[PDB]
């Protein structure tokens, strides 16, 4: 099977990070297929750049020319996966939903870390929209840029890791979802020193999308996510 | 005050109904603008489409270099708003949004009727986030589309109507909301057919902007809102 | 148009504070009448205080000799909209609501600041039966009286700006409301300590009533609003 | 021990007809006091009269001037408890919540059975802010006014029944709550053919107020229903 | 009427405990009788221990061959009030629940202060499921096992005070809930140190369980509670 | 690696149809084991039974003896899950949670059809406890006991159809999910005349559970389910 995974921003080396990941849990004779948007924010922190991902991913996706299987959205609390699941008849999982149910399989409560805090109500938001809030204790932010985590994965690890002990500690948080594409990787690492399950969405979302093929299903194309009805378009 | 009226789809037939419902509202020396997003679909009608008109309506304000005051989005149930928050220093306000808000003052719960059954999903999920939903006694769809709104308007009409009154009669609505931008200016005549209020999103935000702009009140800029973070942002 | 703005008190001062407010914002040609109940309690403090407002307002609306377009109910988190709704054929908005409805049109979350921790459930109860409560980030108390903030303001002044500001830095609201009727016209000193909008439910609910007379709107009287069934009541 | 049955309307003889109620379950050593308001509606059916209920509540409790233990606010969905909690140091306790909150601990879902529609979000309105509405499976209305079932009690009855019958059927309610304080003492044809605990909120809050009493608890003075602060009052 | 009260662990002095505090609001007429499980955990702290204590109290009550007429779950945040409820045709009541609703009545809202953290998320659940969590202000740990109660019980009574003082404070509760069934009869001690109801959900129960008999009430038997469809069940009784 | 798959119900040929649907999925280098508990009822059908089954398959699971990497527990509704997370230190995936969590993924809403309307609360309330009710557009009963589901497989057929077909068209449901465990196998069919995607929970969870091991991922020890407290016991 072919899966594609893409990156939300438009940051290629974020995108190879994603992709490393992805296939470091893939199943033998699982393709992944890393794809960066062709437009769009470096990295995508705030309302307006995550309706820019969402249509840059779109786009994205559309002008893969090879089939493929599924496709993960891969940003943490991105717009975009209605509009593939819309264009799509094949699943499509964005690993902030894929993080956060992977995570409930395994603790009373899970909280998410993430990057700036002005990306917390979007990530509570797109959560809440999925029915994946109830079991949330808490959406915290590490205070560091995506764009800032390779230059000094000490600092970068350390931000995060008091976050996650203080939803931990405060929130009752018994499980981490990391709360952004570019911390594909670090949950082991934040795991070590948290004491808890540490889930990453990327490597999360891979094998949902795996088990949804596997499984043979599909975006059900009844309603909501049904194929646009044909219009005139202009651009796209 | 200048105030830009912006429809979500690319039909300009549909912005001059739209901002001429806006101007019959409007207060003395306010002057609304109707824009046409230069981009997207001729109706809006699921999230594909409704993402696309988040950029489109987003790039056409962005366009606009003109002074201005306050922007509403005249499209129902579509993302997009809080871009334009971000994007903006002046109020903000979604027809949707405005039509809900202003129908929980006229009575115990509201009605939303739209067009097309698989837009009432996207209109639900927008008044949850809103936090607008909890006096929505439903969302119906007329099962008319947008576009069909000209095309066959006494047979629209009496669709519309028909899900007003199954919200009246079933669902305990007190007043209809428009659940379309394209149904700007047919609240008068559902309101004689029903016997409840009938609000127009776009004359309500209409309202709604301007008393935002004379309160003194903008987009809080303080977190969710705040301007975006400057940094590479290709095509 | 004329629109009646009843405060929930029986202090006069205050009535005529509110109405001065409300005419400053009033468009031209909007006629505010400010009117003080006959009866009740010189300041609303409580469950009591506040059932004994909703009727002293419902008394003294009726008691209203001359035409009007709309009535305005000037009390932060009192009892008695629904009354008035069933008796009048003009739209009725209370400053609560008013306030909050405004407020969501501008931030992500607000918070309401009021004055007695003990009228914070009331005020909630207010807005969770107006269905306003969900993007309410919190109702705080300065934890200074009503009669007090005309008698001695500064430190009350203080005392509300850091509820204002601990409700954006903890309870991450990002518009304040002001919580007490005679708070019109404090919102200056918030507004710039906080750097958030600031809310006034007297000059939120002008706008709104006079909108709504606009619009042609005014209370459904098909079911829960409907015009009382006429019947025998004693002392009516 | 004392306990007021305080009927929320001005009908004296549904007075009586309460206090009745309520003397059939008081415990040995409970005096049951009805009392009737000295002013507001004949029956309390919407906002209105209800707001109107509860200071004539409030007073008829406060113009009473012998000892008592416990009060029972004998309506089905008004104002008020709250204003008795804050005026009282004795445990108040309204026919309403005692009626949803005993037959949550009968069924997995209770519904209540009342009188008109337009009171159904009345009391709608009371569960919630009691909390007691989560495992509310409908507010149900008969049709029939408060009066009305005191004119033609066969009909009304099977008006109430047939409620009853499709809050089971339909809405998946378990128990049946009586939704009037004038339906006292019907829960047993109900019963008979619905096959379904029926809770007459009466007898219940008698039962809930004597345990209170029995517990030695009494309402909470911490902050919400503390005393009022002494001030000045008008009539 | 005799009330059956149930202890959910197997530590006997608990359940005479609780009997005691049951007889002392008892009205005339009322018989107590406490029953231990005859097996399970000495004392419920988890869901492993909670979901055993279910199926104990359950077998202990069915077990029981003396006439009966309501029955009260005496452990407070633990499963199986539901299967009772499906295999008797009388009332009954768990404690957690009764201390919850009578509070209601008393504040506009309680909390509930239990023995261990680890508890405290299946008090949160049980509140829930029952509709009674939403005007619970917060559900607290002293920090303290069930039987430190009685080992170490000037600790012990601290410890809960304040939670009970924090509560009040911090979470704005009004009315205090005992959140374990081996804290019966503790209520008036923290009362007169918080200087607000509390409730304990043992006493609260009988009154309630009285009050269901006297009202000629019991558990509907019409979907969710009906009696157990007649099968094949293996190790069972 | 080793799931054990464990019925919930004492029918030994129910488990067998468990355990083959769940070989059917299984990836390469997966067994399934397929338990009977020891005692218990031979069908589920409420709080008696579901309450002695949770105990039924922790004993069962208990003295298995072999070593296994995720437990998967095979009943719709039924209780338990919590113990089992205490009890082990592997992953633990219940089918109902399997099979809402992976329906989810799929469609705005989501409906269970299960056999018997008095299972239709327990189904209601694990949802909820699991905090994945919120997309659940209804759960939905076809009148059918589970043993009556071998007797007579086509009736059952059409009566689970005609709860989905008004699952789809009244509650909008846009997925279905299998709502008994021996309902296995029967998706293609409902999927067929319905024309949306049909979870099944036994095939889900063998997914998950998969994905569960192969992203290193376990219950949380930290609060909730850690090891049970060290303590006299007395067994069952």
Same mark, same amino acid.
């Given at each position: 099977?072919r899966?594609l995974?893409?990156? *939300? ?6 995108? =190879?990070?994603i992709? =490393?990941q /992805?296939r470091? *849990? ?7 297929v890393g ?5 769009g924010?470096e990295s995508?922190?705030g309302?307006?750049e995550?309706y820019?991902?969402?249509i840059?991913?779109?786009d994205?996706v559309?002008?893969y020319?090879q089939?493929?299987? !599924?496709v993960?959205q !891969? ?8 509009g ?12 902030? =939903? +894929?993080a956060?149910?992977?995570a409930m399989?395994?603790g009373?409560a899970?909280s998410?870390?993430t990057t700036?805090?002005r990306?917390v109500?979007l990530?509570?938001?797109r @959560?809440k929209?999925? #029915?994946?809030? $109830?079991?949330?204790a808490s959406?915290?932010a590490? &205070?560091? !840029?995506? @764009?800032?985590?390779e =230059? ?8 995060i ?12 948080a018994?499980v ?8 594909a #990787?670090?949950?082991?690492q934040?795991? $070590?020193?948290? &004491?808890?399950?540490? *889930?990453? #969405?990327?490597? /999360? +979302?891979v ?8 499984? &043979? @299903?599909?975006?059900?194309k009844?309603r909501?996510?049904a ?10």
């Open positions: 099977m899966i995974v893409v990156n *939300v921003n438009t940051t290629a080396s974020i995108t =190879e990070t992709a =490393e /992805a470091a *849990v893939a199943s033998p004779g699982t393709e992944i794809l960066t948007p062709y437009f924010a995508v922190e309302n307006f995550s820019l991902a969402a840059a991913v779109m994205r559309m002008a020319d089939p493929f299987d !599924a993960i !891969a940003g943490y609390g991105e717009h975009g996966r209605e593939l699941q819309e264009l799509l008849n094949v699943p499509v999982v964005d690993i902030t =939903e +894929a956060a149910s992977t399989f395994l009373h899970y998410v870390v700036l805090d990306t109500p990530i509570e938001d @959560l929209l999925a #029915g994946l809030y $109830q079991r949330c959406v915290r590490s &205070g560091m !840029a995506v @764009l800032e985590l =230059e000094d994965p000490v600092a970068a690890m350390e931000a890791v008091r976050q996650a002990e203080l939803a931990i500690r405060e929130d009752k018994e981490i979802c990391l709360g952004c594409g570019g911390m #990787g670090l949950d082991e934040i795991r $070590q020193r948290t &004491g808890v399950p540490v *889930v990453d #969405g990327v490597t /999360a +979302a094998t949902i999308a795996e088990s949804l093929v596997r499984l &043979g @299903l599909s975006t059900s009844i909501t996510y194929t646009p009805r044909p219009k005139k378009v202009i651009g796209w």
